[PDB]
Amino acid sequence: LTEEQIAEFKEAFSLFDKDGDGTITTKELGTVMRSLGQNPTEAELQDMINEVDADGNGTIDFPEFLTMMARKMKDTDSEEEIREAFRVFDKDGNGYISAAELRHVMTNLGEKLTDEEVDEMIREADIDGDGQVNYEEFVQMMT
């Protein structure tokens, strides 16, 4: 792990840890999100913490931030679950999903991303003018 990387993470941690107590509470994190023009729900704040929370005290210490910042978002079987998430939408079974269905899924369901983001995604995906994406190349894009 780099000394550059830890440094910058330390800077990041301070952005949430305003009271200097080395803990991030569910109410401090909501401050920051709401700073960015967001509205979270008390549970949404309580689900995020409970994912980074290995001490169970309810707070985020800097070492659990560091644990979360340095997690294999790409190697820890991240590719198997992201595959099977797409296979919820290939009922045809083909490792292929219509670029149109992709847009409809990325925009109307779940977090509902903006069209410009969906435009960027499809373009940089496996759409080589085949209005199909083979998500095999998609999962690898992100990893």
Partner 1 sequence: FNRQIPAAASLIQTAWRCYAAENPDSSTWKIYIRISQLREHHRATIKVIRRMQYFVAKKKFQQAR
Residues 57 to 96: which contact Ca ion by CB under 5 A?
57, 59, 61
> Would you say 120 or 130 has its CB closer to partner 1?
120
User: CA dihedral in degrees (92, 102, 75, 63; nearest 10)?
Assistant: -140
> Would you say 21 or 81 has its CB closer to partner 1?
81
User: Is 12 one of the binding residues for partner 1 (CB under 8 A)?
Assistant: yes
Annotated binding-site residue? 23: yes
Total residue length of the chain: 143
How far apart, in Å, are the Cα atoms of 19 and each of 12, 22, 27?
Answer: 14, 8, 12
Provide the 3-class DSSP secondary structure of residue 61: strand
Provide the 3-class DSSP secondary structure of residue 133: strand
Interatomic CA distance for residues 96 and 134, integer angstroms: 4
Which among 48-56, 66-74, 80-88, 93-101 is the span making contact with Ca ion, rule CB under 5 A?
48-56
- Using the rule CB under 5 A, which residue among 8, 10, 14, 21 binds Ca ion? 21
Inter-helix orientation angle 26-35/3-16, to 10°: 90
Query: Could you list the residues that contact partner 1 (CB under 8 A)?
Result: 8, 11-12, 15-16, 29, 32-33, 35-37, 47-48, 51-52, 65, 68-69, 71, 73, 78, 81-82, 84-86, 88-89, 105-106, 109-114, 116-117, 119-121, 141-142
Query: Could you list the residues that contact Ca ion (CB under 5 A)?
Result: 17, 19, 21, 23, 55, 57, 59, 61
